[PDB]
Amino acid sequence: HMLTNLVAEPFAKLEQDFGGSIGVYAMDTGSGATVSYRAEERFPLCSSFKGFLAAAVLARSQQQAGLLDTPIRYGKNALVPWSPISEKYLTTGMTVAELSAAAVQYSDNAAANLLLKELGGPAGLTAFMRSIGDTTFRLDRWELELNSAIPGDARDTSSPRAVTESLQKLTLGSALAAPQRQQFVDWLKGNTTGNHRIRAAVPADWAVGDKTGTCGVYGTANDYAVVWPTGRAPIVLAVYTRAPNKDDKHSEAVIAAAARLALEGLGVNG
Ligand SMILES: COc1ccc2c(CP(=O)(O)O)cc(=O)oc2c1
């Protein structure tokens, strides 16, 4: 409780300036110290489910050898907005591994939907999260309907704490086999969409992997990350936002500032 009270006031000021709600859970994997602010509230996942989607693909690849190399062909009707990689391979197809990398590193929507289909839809991804001990995560819909971010709607949400706990298990714990774990970390490390979020709070000499989400309404956006500071154990953290009005805009700077506060609360000199 000590570190959480250390940062309670600055978090309240930050979210009031933002005009919405900020949810943060950060875990120092060395000491076990944690920082929480609205950490048990539900926030829309938006694209952040795509990280867990790729982890679920990797988990299945442990039992289905050759799953990652399977070519997937798709039609033009699969190309929903923000499919920047898959639109370039419409005439050729892509492998499951390439779709997973595109989903993680470019937030590719068509790729995410194609991989969701392979796993049995939103319920199949939810089942995977249940299998690692996450009872909070729920995915209910596909891209782009899952972006609705309706106030009070539990569909397609999780909590910052559950996101951080599941991310820890998948990137640092035993939820994935060692080769699949490293592949998940490497995909997160290569993300291209989060330079202005948690990464903006992380010194250049620290390794970081992240997955972003941006719903586009209700001030709703997020990022989760694993951060490897030099000389100490890694930090896992999740930063989620929402706001009361549909037209409220999200703020990357607010996500970065919340990440800064979480790291400062943990005592990690950034
Ligand atoms: C379809 O429209 C989209 C899809 C994704 C994005 C993303 C990528 P992500 O943050 O969800 O991962 C950032 C954004 O600003 O707008 C978006 C708009």
Side-chain angles (χ1 to χ4, degrees):
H1 286 50
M2 193 275 269
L3 298 194
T4 287
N5 312 340
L6 217 53
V7 294
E9 154 213 309
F11 268 123
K13 170 66 158 36
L14 181 71
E15 91 185 335
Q16 283 153 28
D17 293 342
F18 166 61
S21 298
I22 299 174
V24 172
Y25 192 76
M27 164 191 314
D28 183 336
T29 67
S31 62
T34 60
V35 163
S36 297
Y37 190 83
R38 303 192 186 273
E40 283 81 25
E41 293 185 32
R42 286 186 172 279
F43 291 78
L45 290 157
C46 319
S47 299
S48 74
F49 83 91
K50 296 167 189 164
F52 295 122
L53 177 63
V57 170
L58 288 167
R60 183 165 298 190
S61 85
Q62 297 172 186
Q63 312 279 68
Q64 292 201 323
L67 170 66
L68 299 187
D69 281 322
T70 298
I72 306 292
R73 293 181 62 203
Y74 47 95
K76 189 185 168 200
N77 47 355
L79 294 180
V80 293
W82 198 288
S83 303
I85 307 299
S86 54
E87 72 190 5
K88 309 311 181 191
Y89 298 85
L90 169 70
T91 55
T92 69
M94 301 174 48
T95 71
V96 165
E98 291 177 323
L99 294 168
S100 299
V104 175
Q105 299 174 334
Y106 292 86
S107 217
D108 195 290
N109 274 330
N113 279 346
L114 288 166
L115 293 169
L116 268 173
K117 192 223 293 158
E118 294 291 320
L119 287 183
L125 182 53
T126 299
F128 171 72
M129 299 296 282
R130 296 288 180 272
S131 77
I132 71 170
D134 188 328
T135 57
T136 307
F137 180 100
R138 57 184 291 182
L139 200 76
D140 294 80
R141 291 171 297 168
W142 308 66
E143 290 283 4
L144 305 132
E145 291 77 24
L146 60 81
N147 291 321
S148 55
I150 293 165
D153 188 354
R155 287 181 300 175
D156 308 294
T157 63
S158 196
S159 68
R161 179 162 71 82
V163 167
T164 295
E165 287 169 347
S166 289
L167 185 63
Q168 189 275 333
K169 293 170 182 175
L170 294 164
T171 59
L172 304 168
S174 58
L176 294 173
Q180 280 75 12
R181 180 191 318 152
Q182 187 57 235
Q183 178 65 88
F184 187 39
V185 164
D186 286 348
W187 280 340
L188 295 171
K189 279 181 165 190
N191 182 35
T192 72
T193 65
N195 292 341
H196 307 288
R197 294 179 192 194
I198 293 167
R199 280 169 193 268
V202 175
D205 54 333
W206 303 2
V208 47
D210 85 291
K211 177 78 198 82
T212 55
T214 307
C215 278
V217 285
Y218 289 105
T220 296
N222 54 66
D223 195 24
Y224 58 68
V226 183
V227 177
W228 286 265
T230 70
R232 62 185 295 161
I235 308 292
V236 191
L237 74 163
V239 178
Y240 281 70
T241 77
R242 73 181 122 72
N245 301 314
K246 187 175 182 183
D247 286 338
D248 287 337
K249 298 312 167 199
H250 70 279
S251 170
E252 299 199 286
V254 165
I255 292 173
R260 288 205 195 81
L261 275 186
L263 294 175
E264 291 169 350
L266 293 175
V268 199
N269 199 52

